[PDB]
Design an enzyme around this catalytic site. Sequence first.
Site, PDB file in Angstrom:
ATOM      1  N   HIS A 128     -49.063  51.678  32.720  1.00  0.00           N
ATOM      2  CA  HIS A 128     -47.816  52.403  32.443  1.00  0.00           C
ATOM      3  C   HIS A 128     -48.087  53.822  31.877  1.00  0.00           C
ATOM      4  O   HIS A 128     -47.325  54.356  31.105  1.00  0.00           O
ATOM      5  CB  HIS A 128     -46.942  51.605  31.483  1.00  0.00           C
ATOM      6  CG  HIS A 128     -46.547  50.218  31.975  1.00  0.00           C
ATOM      7  ND1 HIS A 128     -45.285  49.932  32.360  1.00  0.00           N
ATOM      8  CD2 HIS A 128     -47.219  49.008  31.958  1.00  0.00           C
ATOM      9  CE1 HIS A 128     -45.185  48.590  32.657  1.00  0.00           C
ATOM     10  NE2 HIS A 128     -46.368  48.048  32.425  1.00  0.00           N
TER      11      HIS A 128
ATOM     12  N   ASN B 290     -40.088  44.794  31.802  1.00  0.00           N
ATOM     13  CA  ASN B 290     -40.223  45.431  33.120  1.00  0.00           C
ATOM     14  C   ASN B 290     -38.898  45.367  33.867  1.00  0.00           C
ATOM     15  O   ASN B 290     -37.944  44.730  33.394  1.00  0.00           O
ATOM     16  CB  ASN B 290     -41.326  44.739  33.951  1.00  0.00           C
ATOM     17  CG  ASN B 290     -42.729  45.166  33.503  1.00  0.00           C
ATOM     18  OD1 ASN B 290     -42.879  46.214  32.830  1.00  0.00           O
ATOM     19  ND2 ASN B 290     -43.771  44.404  33.919  1.00  0.00           N
TER      20      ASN B 290
END
EC number: 1.11.1.6
Lengths: 84, 308, 726, 726, 83
Positions: B101, B174
Amino acid sequence: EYYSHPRLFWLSQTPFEQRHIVDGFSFELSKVVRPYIRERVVDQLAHIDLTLAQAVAKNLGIELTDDQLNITPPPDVNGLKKDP
Amino acid sequence: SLAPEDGSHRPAAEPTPPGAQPTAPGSLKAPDTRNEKLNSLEDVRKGSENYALTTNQGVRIADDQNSLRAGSRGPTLLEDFILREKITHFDHERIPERIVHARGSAAHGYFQPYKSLSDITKADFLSDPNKITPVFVRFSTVQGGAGSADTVRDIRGFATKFYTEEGIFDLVGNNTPIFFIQDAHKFPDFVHAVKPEPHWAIPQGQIAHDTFWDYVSLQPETLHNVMWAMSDRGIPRSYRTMEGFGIHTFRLINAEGKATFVRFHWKPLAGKASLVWDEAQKLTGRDPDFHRRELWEAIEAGDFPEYE
Amino acid sequence: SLAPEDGSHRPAAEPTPPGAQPTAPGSLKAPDTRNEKLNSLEDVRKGSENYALTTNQGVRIADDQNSLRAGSRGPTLLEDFILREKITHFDHERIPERIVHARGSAAHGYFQPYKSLSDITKADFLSDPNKITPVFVRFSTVQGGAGSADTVRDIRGFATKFYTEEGIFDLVGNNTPIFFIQDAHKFPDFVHAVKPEPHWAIPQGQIAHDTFWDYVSLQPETLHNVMWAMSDRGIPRSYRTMEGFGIHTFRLINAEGKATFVRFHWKPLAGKASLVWDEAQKLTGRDPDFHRRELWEAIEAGDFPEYELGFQLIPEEDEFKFDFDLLDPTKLIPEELVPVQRVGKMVLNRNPDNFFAENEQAAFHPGHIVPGLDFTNDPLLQGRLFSYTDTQISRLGGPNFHEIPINRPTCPYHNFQRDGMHRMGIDTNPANYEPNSINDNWPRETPPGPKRGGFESYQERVEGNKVRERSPSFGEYYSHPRLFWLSQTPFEQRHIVDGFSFELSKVVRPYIRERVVDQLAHIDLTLAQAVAKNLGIELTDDQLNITPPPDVNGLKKDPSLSLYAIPDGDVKGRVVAILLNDEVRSADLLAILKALKAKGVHAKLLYSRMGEVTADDGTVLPIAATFAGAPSLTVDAVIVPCGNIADIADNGDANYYLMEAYKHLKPIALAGDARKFKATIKIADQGEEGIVEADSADGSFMDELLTLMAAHRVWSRIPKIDKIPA
Amino acid sequence: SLAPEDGSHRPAAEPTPPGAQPTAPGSLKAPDTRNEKLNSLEDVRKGSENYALTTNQGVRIADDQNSLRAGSRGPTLLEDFILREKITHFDHERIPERIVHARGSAAHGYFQPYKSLSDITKADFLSDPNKITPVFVRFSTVQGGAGSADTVRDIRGFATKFYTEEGIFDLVGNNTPIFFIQDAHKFPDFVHAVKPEPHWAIPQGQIAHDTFWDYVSLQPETLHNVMWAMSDRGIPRSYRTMEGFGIHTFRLINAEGKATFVRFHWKPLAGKASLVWDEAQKLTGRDPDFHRRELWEAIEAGDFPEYELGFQLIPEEDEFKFDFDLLDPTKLIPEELVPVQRVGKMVLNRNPDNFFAENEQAAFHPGHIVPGLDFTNDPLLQGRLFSYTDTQISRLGGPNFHEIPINRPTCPYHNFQRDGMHRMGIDTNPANYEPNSINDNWPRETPPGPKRGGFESYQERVEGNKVRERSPSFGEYYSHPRLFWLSQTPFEQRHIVDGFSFELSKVVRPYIRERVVDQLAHIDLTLAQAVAKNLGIELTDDQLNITPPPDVNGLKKDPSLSLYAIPDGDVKGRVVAILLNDEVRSADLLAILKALKAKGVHAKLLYSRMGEVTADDGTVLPIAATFAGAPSLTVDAVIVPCGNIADIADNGDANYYLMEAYKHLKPIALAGDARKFKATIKIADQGEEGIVEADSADGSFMDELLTLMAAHRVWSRIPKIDKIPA
Amino acid sequence: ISRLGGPNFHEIPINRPTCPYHNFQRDGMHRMGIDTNPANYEPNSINDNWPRETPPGPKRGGFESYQERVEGNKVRERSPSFG
Ligand code: HDD
Ligand code: HDD
């Protein structure tokens, strides 16, 4: 247990969402240089859903075996065969 | 004075549609947008107008256009502390990016409950609908580096820091409701498989490569999230138009000590929407900053990202 | 065993063309390639076949699928050291990327000089035509992160580490002969301006934004390199087809002590070739790793990147003989005035084994020079010398970065330096200081001399006051941008106009566009009006009347500044897309491939699906990619053989393939019924230059196609492209 | 600037006694001492003799005495890359010291077991009496920084890294058999209490301060290790003359899967010996490096430190059979209940080459176990497993600390971990993940089994709720302190009393001293009274009526807890001061040195100045140190031969030398007219046990002195030292 | 840079100036100050060039080095006057 949730997901999609999934797998696996890996993935898809596995296979120039054509679909999820 | 006479260098401090004004730091664009966390940052915000240019030690710089040299065509002198501080700071600007990420776009906001949840949890931030909790939210892709493109096919992250009266709660989720793998001990294997391959570090921001599919084919537990990533879920139109999920079962605990199992969700009030593959792939070339841009500009316009 | 029974998981350990095998670590692909540096890395290389999986402490792991928990549905236990070591290593994988040139691709190779240069330099690596010097080379963009795209419009870096017998020499250059700024003190200002803007960290890998053009408009020294960046120089076709420059004047020092001024050049032996903007931009989406891939694949194919090192040499007494200052890194030395003297050849012939360990961790620094070289007072070079040692302390974790295997000298190194984080060398010297008696003063200083001597700086005269002042000799900004512009072909000029026009359209604050247009009016009026027009700006009467800057030492142009003015094309290693149909005319394909093979041009066989197709005579044709999967952006030409054309004739993708390729000025060749595709790109019945066409693919169809490829792109096609919706 | 013509700058590469030669790096002092780990470090050892001085990039330096400047009185130039590399390296020499055990001294050596232990453990390193395992051992104090003193009152660390064929095992122990606290969660509280106080960072290397005693008074679980710390165990004579203990119960696991509980011990083959407090405290000033020095010199002399590894073994079925919990690290297992079984011998026989590279950067961690060993739920051990891998990430700069040469396994290691700062290993594996097919899944997992198997945890039953709760079985704090007390000799008891009294007298807040005396009243009333009296505190009636804790499983004493109750003297490697005069009776010195040499006891020849004196027969005697320069604190005994005693008779320092030695209970031998010194130490004509005297230094004279040295100190003199002003 | 963990050591409270400090330097580990300036470079127009250089003068002026004369060759040489 690995296939019943993929299956529930697949069957909950609209027909155009399913076409886009088939397209995504087909494009992706076209970029895999080692052909046996593409075949092993197709084997997995045949454990989820035969229509999906055939449509991806057609795009890769792979032919399902008899065996693959006969894999029993995984069970529903608690009696669900889709969730919109 | 270098600014244009007509003052068209400075965007107006009012909401404006995308492309109507140059974009700006948030406290300059929207100075009267406040929450307790944004106010608490005031001790470290530094302005600039009307201030003299200095070293970090507070010494005023006279000539910020030249190194100190023996003759105006001469060698640079070691005693030029102004140059060495400015180049030292530059030389050390970067910090390691996140392991996963690393590509992400963030904004400030606030959360408020619809009603007291005290029957099922004693979490102070859920105790009263008049409780306003500042948040900072970072949306992200997973695989690519911090300089990778936004509209890749990938999972997206959706991480929210709740600055509560009883501590920071981070809900680190997520945009799909499951993960690829079952046990943490395999995360470096999965991540290495999806990441650029180790001999030549290709490909960036792409799962379409042998090692990813090698791992999938050998680890059927992945197939469920692989379905999600192969769907248009994998290519959102906007961080404003995707769902969020905590993925794990957690517990709520009430004042009685009773535990309820919970899974967390965020539902986009702007609805769910994704690109198509050809459009997303081409968009990584035409504007690799598309999602970052469109989040920033939605907020500037007053199209505030809202989630339930 | 998870590997397939037929061994098709393992790439052939021999040269193979792009696409033919999966790519591999270089010591596995090409075990037989060697040089002194690659051999010296052997002590740190680690294999894997037949070995047990262990912790980093050497403990064998039984189950690498699960954490240790109390019950198989229980909590994970803190005593699970195998989980925590593996996750700890993972959690700390990343190191800071480079502040600039974070995106780069590197290979091993070697260098050899054509003859001894001892009359002009005592540098050992240049002393003997038989002395071969290993190199490691990293090519890079400047602005974007390590995960940004390759085919951006930007400057490129070209950095070479020479592992010499007298020390590491790093030649750290770019692909344009000047830089944007004059004094190092302004580097953080310039770099912050080109970098993503600080509020929102946009844009990535792009100079097309307000703060870059604000800086340029206020700092006309920048305009020279900006002209280069706006030209097609900003979008190379490959790292193999761009020039390299050291930019600065340095010095060569011979055994007599005589200093000669020098600027360094690399000449691409594959020639100069660039993309066009629409192609380059779209390619950052279709394959953001295109240059990294192309470099790695050329090496795997034996299309080794080759470059010729060259020197422009100026005697000390000629320091002031030019209209510009030799120490001004915004000025170039025209080859018409000082020719490039050929020095030697560099060949890149092995990829790394591990990109992180060798590429990401490599540290190049232009202060790493060797006896026989020295600096000058160029005030951008002068500040570089501070930066590159400094930045390594955080990027690579401390002062022992030269112990990281890729950075290690192959020659001896001994000194009194000690400790520091992750210290590898274990010094046995009783002394850690000099002078010492307790080790008889070893290791000892070495006087300068003709060979194998100590480094001594050339004793250049310095005279002046301690000032923060720009030399007035540097304060001329327009004559070199003018020489560059006039040196460009009319099509290269059009592409420059289009570069500025497209960039300035992305600047939100209109006054910045106007200010840049005014700067362009000081360089060339034609350039300035053509950009203004594209921006809806009208030049004032004053702007119309600006006298152009003077020529440079009598030069009205220098064609060495153009990419294309003087052809230097080379088809070896380029690639052709071959669009197949379900019943290909096999004699077309045989003739196409035979002709491609004889010139070392690669092919990729594309169709509408993966798998195979079978030719008219029954030959099975393996498909490499789909039309959409390997777009025309990635090839240099497109050839369509005959057969069942009806199969692909109303295929949207196959049609769009020829349209994209036509738009981007690529050679297209059409045989027999493939000629039907003329309608899609609007080619007249009698055809046009740059479309090859015939009843079949002979003899002479392929010579014509290969002749178009040697000329790279079909520039004469340009006025025709606007017609086509592509 | 060079070596003396005679070669006297260089130590002989032979065993030599302390002071005979300058000390040197191990590989130069003892080049033929080898083992598999020492040999494996050869890739990184760097020599010096005959080599040219260079930059880290391998460029030869011509002038290492000057910076580059514009004129010889001018400013330093930024282009001086030699200066800046050398200064940059210097500026970044330091790394963070260890959070605890920052002060420590290390050596290389080897271990082997006496017989195979395969019946109780499948650990490879314990499987064959003739399979030798290299070790590296670091001894340490706990509280003070890396530049604190050695002979402080503190616990000592005793950490051994075993480089086994099946992985690194680190046995990370201390010199007392328990620790101060029960649960790792409290380690920062305890450590912060013992470390220098946070406002002013005082005191260094000392527990005699308020915060330490505050914590102790409020946490009676600490009392047990506090008793050991207050006894002379707190002040060892040498790292060679202390016990080691792993402290925790661990598990041994054999080939059949059977778990035996085990506590680890090291027995010093040189015997147990400690300083006395006045001596230890003054020695931190006279030589803050005394333990580091004495270890290094013993190894240079051939007095290699030897330790016997021993295990206490408790069958699983006996877990709950004692009155204490086996998993409670504040409890010891008395040897009278569970004997130590001898397991093997470790010999340390070579010093490092570079202290920083090998000692400062060594990383030991008790989670580094191998198959055949396993953990228990001891809640202090459990949290140690988190801490040691975590701390190394900052201390050693990242997750590649196992690649720092001292830390490297000598057995194979291969896995899919990649990257991290200062990554040395270049992996060639196409795969960086498993499962993989692309490398046929190598490196592979390995099932557990009898030898060479993967690691699997013992499948201990876990049953309970998730709680932060101390086991009620840990809630007993007095009975072990008491067993320890009652097991000391009367003089060891006096020294415990003296240690508490001195320490608490330094606590500024009187209530804390009071609260500590209350704790002591719960251990032993005689102890508590003797401490109270020195503090001017009077026990209340209630304190006087506290019931003593129970005996430990019926034990009223265990003499294995005392340093001295059972003789285990060994004089080899001890050292005597010999006080010279300007006309030594050579016949005395001859007899002294012969008898010392026969028992491996060293000598230092001391005088009132340096240089030489000449004996009665012409023998030239070199002087090692002056009386003041090498005080009696640094020796085990003092000998004064006859001769011209008038020369030294009224020397203040010579007289004080005997006073300080006398005070500190050391044996003193006086020959001939040296007997006139009896007056300085008030000894009657009839003489005194502990003072050897005769007309000359003969056979009998040296036997008596040697016998006294074998008993370490003259405890019987204690009543007589309060008199003397020293 | 190593002792104190990076280039922002002037932001560690004890080291902070008590007078104003503003410039175009950004980022680095442990960065405390949150700069709101639209510009992180000079010269700039987007923030009217603030913060600005300041000419040297009698009080509150910019730093300028004394213009000492330098004359000599580039040498690594100790002055005989030091011998
Ligand atoms: C004063 C600062 C400064 C200035 C004025 C320049 N550079 Fe630079 N450059 C750096 C400071 C820097 C750096 C910060 O030191 C980098 C980034 C990280 C590193 O190791 O070096 C770097 C990286 C870097 C790289 C990538 C090296 C690699 O592959 O790791 C190249 C090719 C160049 N530079 C080339 C140039 C050229 C040709 C310049 C002008 C003629 C130039 N730089 C001006
Ligand atoms: C969870 C915290 C913690 C706890 C409860 C302990 N330790 Fe520890 N110990 C550390 C955390 C730690 C550490 C922070 O991880 C150190 C310092 C730096 C390092 O490498 O490890 C360390 C160093 C250290 C060293 C020095 C090794 C060397 O020379 O480098 C020894 C001998 C010990 N410990 C022994 C013990 C013993 C015998 C303990 C209990 C019976 C113990 N420690 C409890």
